[PDB]
Amino acid sequence: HHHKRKGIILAGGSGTRLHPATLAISKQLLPVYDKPMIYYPLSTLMLAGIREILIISTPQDTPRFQQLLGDGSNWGLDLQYAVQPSPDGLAQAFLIGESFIGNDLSALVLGDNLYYGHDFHELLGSASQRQTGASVFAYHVLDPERYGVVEFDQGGKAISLEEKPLEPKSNYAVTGLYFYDQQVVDIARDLKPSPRGELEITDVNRAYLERGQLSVEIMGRGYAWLDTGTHDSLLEAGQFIATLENRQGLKVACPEEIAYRQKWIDAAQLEKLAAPLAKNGYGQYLKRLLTETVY
Amino acid sequence: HHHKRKGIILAGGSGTRLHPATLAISKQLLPVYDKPMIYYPLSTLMLAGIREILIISTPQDTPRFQQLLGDGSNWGLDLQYAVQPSPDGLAQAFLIGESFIGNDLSALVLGDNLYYGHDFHELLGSASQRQTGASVFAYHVLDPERYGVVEFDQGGKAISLEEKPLEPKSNYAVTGLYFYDQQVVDIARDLKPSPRGELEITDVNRAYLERGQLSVEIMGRGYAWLDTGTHDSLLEAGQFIATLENRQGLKVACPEEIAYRQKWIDAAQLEKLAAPLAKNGYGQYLKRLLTETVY
Amino acid sequence: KRKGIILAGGSGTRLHPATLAISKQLLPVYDKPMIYYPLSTLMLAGIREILIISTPQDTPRFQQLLGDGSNWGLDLQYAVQPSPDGLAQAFLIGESFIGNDLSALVLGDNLYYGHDFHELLGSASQRQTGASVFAYHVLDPERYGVVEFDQGGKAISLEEKPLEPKSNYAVTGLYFYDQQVVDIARDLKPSPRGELEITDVNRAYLERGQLSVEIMGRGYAWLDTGTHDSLLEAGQFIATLENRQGLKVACPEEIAYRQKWIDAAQLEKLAAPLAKNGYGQYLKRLLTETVY
Amino acid sequence: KRKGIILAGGSGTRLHPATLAISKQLLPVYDKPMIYYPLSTLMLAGIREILIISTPQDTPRFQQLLGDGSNWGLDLQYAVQPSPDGLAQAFLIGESFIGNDLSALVLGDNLYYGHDFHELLGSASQRQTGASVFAYHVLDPERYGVVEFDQGGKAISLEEKPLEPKSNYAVTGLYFYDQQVVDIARDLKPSPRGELEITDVNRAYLERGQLSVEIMGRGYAWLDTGTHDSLLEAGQFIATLENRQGLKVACPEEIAYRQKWIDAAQLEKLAAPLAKNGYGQYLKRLLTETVY
């Protein structure tokens, strides 16, 4: 009898690549300017209207995310948690997240991706509304070799996907934000590991492409999709957010704000979250959101 | 007998505020990352479909802008030039630009304002399409005291404008990009100087407001409106553009690109502009635009 | 001999939510945890025996990061400061650690850089009586302990965060002390603000005419990591220097190796688990390259 | 006595369109034109008599900025380099300016910062025979003149932009010369690349055993302003230092005042037209404040 879309954030082991900074704490707990990196994809899923979210991290890191975020109920969310013992590729998320997904639609977001721009809400909404097939976003980059790359024909139809090609067919990278129908778990179960031993998200997306069920929306150049892959790019992302926030006196990817604007929490709930933070600019910001109209 | 909108860039004296950097060359000739500051508002007017543009600068600086930009015909534009002897306020632009405006619609842009974001073309187009009255944009800022400030009532109607108020009524600044009908010159002619001796753009905009002819569109938080008022903010703006451009391998506010995408110049014309620039990344970029599809 | 204290104290809620569930002095400045910077500073002054004082929450996190220090030729101990009751409390908490030895205190969020910094530390630590501090010209002296000089350059007053500062010389977060400091700290009354003040310890030395105040020149960088904006500035400053030089600032393994506290075999062992990133590659490179 | 040359040469089209109709070495690094930095460097080495060599297009722009230098206690002259035919051409163009005196050359886009920089310049300029250069450890030595040292630290080879560099020590864009340099430059054949190379002048001194190569230590900042990305890094580096200290790096008026080339009356006159911004306020402040 009938009378919905779940989220997954993959916040896994960045191995030893960013050591020694990441000896102290996992990558997606490092801040970008003023807030932990995971706040950014979490906020992204929230902006897409997703409230029920599974956070996949290492056994070691699970407790630390849990300590930061809890069960989400203060922000009107239902956050759950699962361990990824080993870094065996991004598609593993769907096998780990299998019982969490159930028979629902899903969205996957990488824990180290930051997005910003105008009408991002509307760009997400058109992905999450398409209730069959899958939807991904293509973004023009300088270094497409580092990503899944999309080739378009002359009428703008997607015709191939390639994982980290040495000779990319275009400058269009697939961003680390994906929307899936109920077929994803069964596609993911049939994947054989790749040459380097990972369950690849590109192979999942190619299965949808081969069935004619993949929507590739362009994420325009007027959106910022930022890179937290290196210490240098983590620093750029910090500068970028700081510049915007200090210009505007508005925050990017403040989860409490997003829950309040989605009406998942009300003004009294937002005031209670502001109380313990009253003595810093972040809690003062939440307080200011109770009385200021922001368009 | 019948069978159009002109642009003005006010690139005037920043006095001695940014000295000694500006002893060598005027403010709007200083670069923001890789291109002279004036490229940014020029590109903004171009994106609005404006081809016929008057550049107002000091007698000293006029020749230097002229040397940089010429008459615009290489980029499919008709740039003209006029001197502002003295820094007597922004509204003077309409008296200086009087014969240039003629009986047409106009757009005014400050030579030190940078804008960026998604569907900026569409945001401009809806201003320039409204062929009577005036249109301005409101942008949430931290420091509204430095700008013209807009007060909205509870239904979102603009009800007051104030120039640099010590006690701002909102955090909404009027950005330095304005669209005017044929009434602007006559409003500007009736302005008495303000307490500090300037012909104020806020007084022009209030005249439209009092006639019920001012449209105030919100420029959303997903747009970046950057500040080149200080050495620090000029540096932020540099970092901001560099981060975006190096992420994307695409340029922000490249005039040649904008003229090519407006179809004001064709592929052969763009190739000829790329030739003298062939030995640097900027000319290599223009060359790459001849063969790459960018969405 | 001289023992060191790093005060990696509580920043309260000021850097929340970055610091929710994540210790301030474990936040990275560019590529390495904040605490590497004061640690390296102490190590550069020749100090191997170091006490890390932090919150009840954060102390075990530093322990789990750094252990007893033996891998870098150090002797690290740990103590907790229950409550942010003033910087001078370090000497009470740290009484039995200091014992009857000379000491140096460094603040956990203070970053230093410059030419002959080794020698500037050397000259302070060699002075075996009195106390030694550094005065650095700053834009906002009101945020710090301020030093007033007379026309002949003698220090004549110290004030903690004065509303009307007598100079632009701030006392940096690096202090050297003789065997008197514990008893000076023990006889302190808390200030109006409710803190055992480090400036109050330093004035006590000044009143005895036993405070050396040396100028840390304008060619040195003393950076603060109090706020999100300063932490960011500091990252960009270090990254700019490191990417230019292909050398690191405040890499403890390098400093221990250069002090001869660890040898080439042990440096090589430290490089192995970091081999697949640039930090281990740098440690490996330091075995074969002559760096003047 | 020692005369100076600033080579503010042609960067071609590489920084276009920023440099279209606007001279490279007049682009600002943070708050001041690029050329203030090498000028100040020369001024810090005690050199008052300075030749600015630039393009036919840019030379009069520097002239119109700086004039004869008399307002800062300097003696500035100007010469043109018709074509970017190598850095060593400075000595041919500058032959009659150098006369029979000692010289120093500095590259117009080179920025230096650090403790006791004054003394490092002092020691090079005091050496009245041979030539003196500085070797600075860098990440990308292939972009520079590279110095090879033997196991005892003696310089044994110099190579201009080697595809396989023998070390990570780059020769900085600051060179001190005796009365031989003009005749060495005059006897140079152009390289395969079509340039009169400064490394070729320096090897000629090395071959005579008259090249001093001193290490510019890792505590000094030597920044390059070749590209848009480096020019930006340099701005952020200087701004971070200046906003922290409330002191300026490479403010020529301050350096002339501190060298006693201009007095307090003249510094005050220079402050007046800049009074309404921070730069003049700083100059005014330097009349009453003691800065160590």
Ligand SMILES: Cc1cc(Cn2c(N)c(N(C)S(=O)(=O)c3ccccc3)c(=O)[nH]c2=O)ccc1Br
């Ligand atoms: C429509 C709508 C607007 C907003 C306003 N908003 C926006 N636009 C943003 N952005 C600037 S965003 O859409 O680009 C964005 C949202 C979440 C995470 C990253 C970026 C934000 O960070 N926070 C925020 O409250 C929030 C919720 C909803 Br529903």
Ligand SMILES: Cc1cc(Cn2c(N)c(N(C)S(=O)(=O)c3ccccc3)c(=O)[nH]c2=O)ccc1Br
């Ligand atoms: C529709 C359209 C898109 C573009 C693409 N484009 C965009 N979007 C941008 N932007 C990132 S922008 O719309 O925010 C912008 C344009 C001009 C000046 C500043 C920002 C740009 O700088 N250059 C550019 O070619 C150009 C012309 C036209 Br008409």
Ligand SMILES: Cc1cc(Cn2c(N)c(N(C)S(=O)(=O)c3ccccc3)c(=O)[nH]c2=O)ccc1Br
């Ligand atoms: C003399 C000496 C030099 C060095 C080299 N060195 C230097 N100079 C530095 N500096 C750039 S520093 O002296 O300004 C510095 C040292 C420790 C912590 C911060 C800065 C460094 O960070 N690491 C380093 O190995 C190490 C130990 C000793 Br003893």
Ligand SMILES: Cc1cc(Cn2c(N)c(N(C)S(=O)(=O)c3ccccc3)c(=O)[nH]c2=O)ccc1Br
């Ligand atoms: C000893 C001395 C110190 C000073 C102080 N000083 C210093 N140290 C600096 N430096 C920070 S510097 O020596 O590293 C430097 C000098 C000139 C150009 C670049 C950096 C400066 O920029 N300006 C300045 O007035 C001036 C003249 C003389 Br002689």
Ligand SMILES: [Cl-]
């Ligand atoms: Cl876009």
Ligand SMILES: [Cl-]
């Ligand atoms: Cl928006």
Ligand SMILES: [Cl-]
């Ligand atoms: Cl110094």
Ligand SMILES: [Cl-]
């Ligand atoms: Cl050094």
